[PDB]
Amino acid sequence: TCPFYKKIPGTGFTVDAFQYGVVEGCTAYFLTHFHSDHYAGLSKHFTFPVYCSEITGNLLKNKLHVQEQYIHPLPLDTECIVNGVKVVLLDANHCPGAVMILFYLPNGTVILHTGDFRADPSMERSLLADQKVHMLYLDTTYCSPEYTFPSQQEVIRFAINTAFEAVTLNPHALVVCGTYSIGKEKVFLAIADVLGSKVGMSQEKYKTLQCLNIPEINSLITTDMCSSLVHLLPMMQINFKGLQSHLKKCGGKYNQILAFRPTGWTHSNKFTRIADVIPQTKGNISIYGIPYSEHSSYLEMKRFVQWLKPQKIIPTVNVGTWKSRSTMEKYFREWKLEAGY
Ligand code: NI
Numbered sequence: 322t323c324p325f326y327k328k329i330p331g332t333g334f335t336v337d338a339f340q341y342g343v344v345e346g347c348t349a350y351f352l353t354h355f356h357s358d359h360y361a362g363l364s365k366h367f368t369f370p371v372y373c374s375e376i377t378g379n380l381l382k383n384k385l386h387v388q389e390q391y392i393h394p395l396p397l398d399t400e401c402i403v404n405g406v407k408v409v410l411l412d413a414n415h416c417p418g419a420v421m422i423l424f425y426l427p428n429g430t431v432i433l434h435t436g437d438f439r440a441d442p443s444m445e446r447s448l449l450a451d452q453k454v455h456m457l458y459l460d461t462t463y464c465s466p467e468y469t470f471p472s473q474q475e476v477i478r479f480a481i482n483t484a485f486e487a488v489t490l491n492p493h494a495l496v497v498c499g500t501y502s503i504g505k506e507k508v509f510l511a512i513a514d515v516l517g518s519k520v521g522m523s524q525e526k527y528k529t530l531q532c533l534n535i536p537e538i539n540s541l542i543t544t545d546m547c548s549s550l551v552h553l554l555p556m557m558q559i560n561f562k563g564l565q566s567h568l569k570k571c572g573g574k575y576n577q578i579l580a581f582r583p584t585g586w587t588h589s590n591k592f593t594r595i596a597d598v599i600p601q602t603k604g605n606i607s608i609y610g611i612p613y614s615e616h617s618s619y620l621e622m623k624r625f626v627q628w629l630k631p632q633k634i635i636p637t638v639n640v641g642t643w644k645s646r647s648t649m650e651k652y653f654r655e656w657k658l659e660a661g662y
Contacts, residue, residue: 326635327457329434332406336434336458339363342563348404353436354419355380363387372403374410376418379532380503398448405496411447413438415615416504419531423448433629434458435637439473440617440625449629457631459474462616464649468586469619470603470612471595477511479595480581480611487579488550494577496551497567499559503529503616505583510541512581513551519551547574556582561603577605583613583657623656630662 323341328334333348339362344350352373353359361372365386370393373381378394381387395401397410397420407425417435424432431454438460488494496516498509513520520542522530527544535541543549554567559582568578589598590612590620615623626634634653638644 324640326637326640329424329432331428331430332424333404334406336422337436339367342367349451351422351434352377352381353413353434354416356416356437356504359437360385367391372408374418374420376532376534377420379534380418380529383532384529387575387654408602409448411444411449414441414444415439416502417506417535418503423454424590430455432456432458433631435460437462437615438617439615440621442624444625445628455632456635457626457629457633457635458635458637459622459626460616461622461625461636461649463586463614463619464622464636464639464652467591467617470586470590470614473507473613475595476611476613479598480508480609481511481515483609484579485515487577488516491577493575494579495568495571495575497559497564497580498551498553499556499580500526501556501583503533505613506533506535508581508583508611509551509553510612513541513549516550519543519548519549520551520553524552526553546571559608561608563607564606564608570623578607580606580608582608582610585614585616586612587647599653623652626653627656627660628661 323335323338323344323426327336327338329336334351335344335347336349336351337353337359338344339360349370349372352371355377363385365388367387368391371381371391371396372393375394378392381392382389391537395410397412399409402407409423413419413421413436419436421436422434431452433454435458442635484496496512499577509520522542524544527542530538530542546552559580564578564580568575587610598609600609636649639649
């Protein structure tokens with residue numbers, strides 16, 4: 322049954338709640354983004370209205386075959402009326418098509434549901450600046466002070482410089498990048514751009530990227546692996562056995578692999594700087610784990626919440642254990658006493 326933190330009081334609405342059957346009283350099902358733990362349950366047999374971004378709507382139609390008559394895409398940064406209630410979708414700085422949702426309840430309460438997000442100071446100048454928010458349904462994935470990681474720009478600078486150095490020393494080196502969901506496309510696109518190559522990938526992954534409204538995409542990606550020297554593979558193949566096997570498939574065109582795994586956080590973060598990251602190597606294969614996050618760091622999350630000053634916080638991540646729930650509640654109170662709301 323549907324947990325409370327997925328239901329929006331005073332409405333017929335749920336958020337990211339497609340795996341519980343027909344939810345009692347739900348007139349509209351919102352989907353924040355196209356990641357499997359959030360869309361789990363959707364398919365071509367779904368017959369209720371789905372509210373989402375244009376990009377998420379492209380993926381529901383093409384990848385899951387949801388019928389068009391049930392897909393309701395909304396433009397961003399625009400006041401819209403859904404079943405009698407004003408809503409706005411805001412960019413969540415997560416994966417492509419990911420949104421936060423502002424609900425303006427008939428009784429005067431305002432609720433922000435962040436979906437999955439990476440907080441940024443630019444959000445302080447969106448439509449959030451313009452009224453009070455009473456209740457915040459918060460992506461708490463990294464809500465603990467140990468979770469530090471660099472900016473996305475520092476991480477991409479590292480990746481581009483590493484790849485261009487390796488391939489210029491050895492023009493017969495192949496670069497491979499792992500993936501298992503949408504998001505983090507900057508990693509492989511930035512590396513292919515510095516090398517003067519398109520990115521090569523499977524038909525299934527190419528289809529997925531063609532749903533994303535990325536400018537000039539036909540110029541950046543391809544299904545012809547033979548023409549490309551940056552390949553995308555499933556994340557599960559980014560290990561020495563999977564990579565040796567891939568190199569065999571390339572018919573002696575290459576003699577070395579440099580591979581990237583864009584992880585979220587890994588405890589190498591608590592000691593080591595981005596400058597200092599080193600790979601795991603076996604023979605002519607090197608694998609770099611790089612800390613490219615699409616969720617808030619602890620400090621980014623804290624700045625957002627202290628700026629927004631909500632009256633009540635509802636976590637949506639790490640809610641399964643009493644120890645986690647107690648830890649998060651303690652940081653919420655610290656933040657509130659430090660800032661004075
Ligand atoms: Ni996500």
